A paper describes a structure:
Here, we report cryo-EM structures of human H1-containing tetranucleosome arrays with four physiologically relevant NRLs. The structures show a zig-zag arrangement of nucleosomes, with nucleosomes 1 and 3 forming a stack. H1 binding to stacked nucleosomes depends on the NRL, whereas H1 always binds to the non-stacked nucleosomes 2 and 4.
In our structures, we observe a compact stacking of nucleosomes 1 and 3 that is similar to type I interactions with a contact formed between H2A–H2B dimers. The observed stacking does not allow for interactions between the H4 N-terminal tail of one nucleosome with the acidic patch of a stacked nucleosome and thus leaves the H4 tail free to engage in other interactions. Whereas the inter-nucleosome interactions appear to be very similar, we note a slight relative tilting of the stacking nucleosomes that positions their dyad axes almost parallel, in contrast to type I interactions in which the dyads are slightly tilted toward each other. H1 is absent from the stacked nucleosomes of the 4×177 array, but is present on nucleosome 1 in the 4×187 and 4×197 arrays, and is present on both stacked nucleosomes in the 4×207 array.
Author numbering:
A (entry chain P), G (entry chain L): 20 to 102
B (entry chain O), H (entry chain K): 37 to 133
C (entry chain N), E (entry chain R), I (entry chain H): 30 to 124
D (entry chain M), F (entry chain Q), J (entry chain G): 10 to 118
DNA sequence: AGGCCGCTCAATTGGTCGTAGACAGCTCTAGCACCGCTTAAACGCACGTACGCGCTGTCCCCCGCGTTTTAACCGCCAAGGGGATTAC
DNA sequence: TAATCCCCTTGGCGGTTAAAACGCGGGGGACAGCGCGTACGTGCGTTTAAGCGGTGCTAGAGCTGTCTACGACCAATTGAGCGGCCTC
């Protein structure tokens, strides 16, 4: 029922490709796990607010629009999913 | 002799290509499972719209690319081309986090 | 049917044909521009509300909106927006 | 015996819905009264910004020999206008990619 | 002839003497405290208006305000504020 | 002929005004209608928050052997708490100075 | 009554004092004019907002409430001036 | 011989002395003259509440201070103690300036 | 036909559901709770009796009980107890 | 005819029975006359201590993945608090066990 | 100058009232979750190739420091009117 | 929006070292050339769960009559709470 490890599912070549999109030419081996940790922290911050929205909505299925609300709260407003 | 590129060449080609390209670079379904397993860390048995998973995705990679641009700025400010995690923690402190 | 939901597709399309009669548009870009117009609408509306409290004004007028534009929107964009809105409000004042 | 019910957008000579903007401001909790030139002025600002963004998007689509507006074209247009950039610094475009930005120190000799 | 300007001086003085009867105060510290109470009041009130708009609520209730507490107020302070807020609404409904 | 005046702040048993917070929320143009638990909950939250501000101020003043609160005490109170720092990362304080904070590289040997 | 060179009125030892409050030990010679320029830009932004407030308030005297609101709009909210 | 401290000792004495200080580090009259000077460019004959001038003073002082913790975090990141204006520009541009 | 036996059941149940709304109760833990309540009640009551004797006071007020809290309970929880007790007598005199 | 009554527990807004604590004080042979602040102060103190130990019981139960309290959790909560140990040093707990406490010489290597 | 204490003022709120808000119930239905299917993308992995990072000694130089000087800052003083505000 | 007033700011002025300004012996700082251990981009085969496209379905998303809790608002009245003060 429960899942224990899918932060590994954000794989190392995915991080490598993003740092290429992020412009990093050489990536330490120490980078991948701490990037996983800090994105872990940020996603917890986003989804905690999203859950707060979710039972503030009396719903059980999470929608994208509250994700938009939470990201716009955190100063990371995204275009392409509002409404 | 099989062809082999010098280090950084394929990296620079990748840099050019994913600056050119716009698609997601992380697998969507392990990402989705991560979303669900951290959801149950807050509230169990939550269901997720695939749209919500994707919006969370490009939020995640955009946030990441912003951090890596700041990381590159710190690393070249540290006179470096390879980033080490002190760069990312420094930029995280600079962002007020 | 379903409930009619308001979007800015038709006005973006009319303005697009004003500026580019020849091109098409993706619905993803249409939604991004809908998010844009709603976001900037909320930015300017909240700032006009801020100045309405700062000036203790129960009514937000075009003076307040122009003030908010001069705050948020930078420079030449701000002054040509002033020109465009002034021209529009003179035409609407003259109907 | 009423005359023609004319649209306020065309009264402003404009495309953006004056009725929608004025109604949203009446229902958006900013001021209970909204000055008459306020939504007309606001929608004029919106249409001016929208028109210049759509012009940049069409020119960028023509630059990459495409005839349809793409979120990549939106990224490459808005992120390359510095007043639009600092107007929208913390704004994410979904599937827009990034600007092509290689540092000069990263480029070889 | 002068006009009254409202401030939170007597209440902060009350709770200060409630928590520290022997502790004094400076007036500019009270200026910072007034800035504190207005700043956080506007933060949470704007968040509550956001939640009212998002869930289409024309009424900002206890659920909206505690939702804003869980959003903006982080961690341990949030759960305490939940605890005394629940206590306060409970004893208010008994009042 | 009339019920006795016993204020809703005393009904909450809290020093923060229920009436003043409620009228500032209603005047603040957030909603025309505000649920009854909202201002009493908000006043409870604010009075609690200002309370731990006051113990942090009090023991900061007690550390510096003065009975009166100075905004230097407020600087030391705010910036030494991680949740208050997260509350007030971007907030500037009048005449507070900074934390006593020296990097280890600046010290001799 | 015109003023010309009061950016140098923010003195070099004042810059040193601020960096001592900022915890900077050693300060290059290139620093002081760059600090003058960036504070000039920051002040220009803040008082541009304040001037916008004052003309929209139809006033002539610059008030600290406008300073407070301008700093709020730059994410630099200040406590202790009647806010 | 006159008593002479080693370079950096008086600097660190200034560090502790101005962190324990709470007072303003700017002369009041030339700062007021500068704000009148710059604001006269944007609008003529502008008058200033002296309290507003002091608020501008304190906000500017603290803003430059926060810029300086950003700066010396970049400097210890760049393994230097003599900060140079590229550190400030790094802090600004990573901050988004 | 039986006779009532009193306990501290529902009050501890209330405050546990105040601090932990989702946490259950084993009954012999509740017996330990009742015995703890009576034990500490008797300790403080005997302390109030001896202080009443030593001050020659035939009336035991909140000053005696505050003294008893100061005596038995060491430091931190004692000053906390003074805090809610002062707030409680304050709100009770206001009620 | 009569004012509708609140409990003095509700007048304090505290859950412990003020009437019961007061009558057990007056019938416990400590003083024939009892000041008004004494039983409400006592009940507030008691409710705080029971609330604190119940918070310890709850989070200790959540540590052991058990939804409900057990006196093993009570043993762990009393014995791992210094001030409650000072309160209950000589106090025996039914079916509580002890701390997991192994001396350093008892451990191998 | 905190604070305190006598003076005023608007603010706060109770009883009632009239109206709408959203909560709960409830059905419905369409996409989420689930399940079994095929596929080459992912992947991650050990490997030998080329390159990163920060460090010794040095090298050059760059402000930090320590008093002197100095002119204008600061704190004080008497004068003008600007504009900010406040009832209409 | 006309008044206006009074109070709060703006320019002026008679001295003052606090503050700025200045030049100098000086230790520290910054930091590239280059050896050197080395930390990771890279060819490229392999696994397997990811991707794809494919199905029955129901938990909840969303929609629709209800109805009662729910909270705002007006003449009134108050008890707290603020404009003043002075003084320890």
């Amino acid at each position: 029922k429960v899942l224990r490890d899918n932060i590994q599912g954000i794989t190392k070549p995915a991080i490598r490709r993003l740092a290429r999109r992020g412009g990093v030419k050489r990536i330490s081996g120490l980078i991948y796990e701490e990037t996983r940790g800090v994105l872990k922290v940020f996603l917890e911050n986003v989804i905690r607010d999203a859950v707060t929205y979710t039972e503030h909505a009396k719903r059980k299925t999470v929608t994208a629009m509250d994700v938009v609300y939470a990201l716009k709260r955190q100063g990371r407003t995204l275009y392409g999913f509002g409404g | 002799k099989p062809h082999r590129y010098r280090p950084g060449t394929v990296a620079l080609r990748e840099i050019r290509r994913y600056q050119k390209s716009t698609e997601l670079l992380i697998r969507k379904l392990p990402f989705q499972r991560l979303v669900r397993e951290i959801a149950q860390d807050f509230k169990t048995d939550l269901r997720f719209q695939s749209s919500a998973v994707m919006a969370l995705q490009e939020a995640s990679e955009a946030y990441l690319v912003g951090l890596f641009e700041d990381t590159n700025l710190a690393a070249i400010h540290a006179k470096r081309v390879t980033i080490m995690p002190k760069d990312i923690q420094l930029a995280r402190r600079i962002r007020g986090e | 049917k379903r409930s009619r939901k308001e979007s800015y597709s038709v006005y973006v399309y009319k303005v697009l044909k004003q500026v580019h009669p020849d091109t098409g548009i993706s619905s993803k870009a249409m939604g991004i521009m809908n998010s844009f117009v709603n976001d900037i609408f909320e930015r300017i509306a909240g700032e006009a509300s801020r100045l309405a409290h700062y000036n203790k004004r129960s009514t937000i007028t075009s003076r307040e909106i122009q003030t908010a534009v001069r705050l948020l929107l930078p420079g030449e964009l701000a002054k040509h927006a002033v020109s465009e809105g002034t021209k529009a409000v003179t035409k609407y004042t003259s109907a | 015996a009423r005359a023609k019910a004319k649209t306020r957008s065309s009264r402003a000579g404009l495309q953006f819905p004056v009725g929608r903007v004025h109604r949203l401001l009446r229902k958006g909790n900013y001021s209970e009264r909204v000055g008459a030139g306020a939504p007309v002025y606001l929608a004029a600002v919106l249409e001016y910004l929208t028109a210049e963004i759509l012009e940049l998007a069409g020119n960028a689509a023509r630059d990459n020999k495409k005839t349809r507006i793409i979120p990549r074209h939106l990224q490459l247009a808005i992120r390359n206008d510095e007043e639009l950039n600092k107007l929208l610094g913390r704004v994410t475009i979904a599937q827009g990619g990034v600007l092509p930005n290689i540092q000069a120190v990263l480029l070889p000799k």
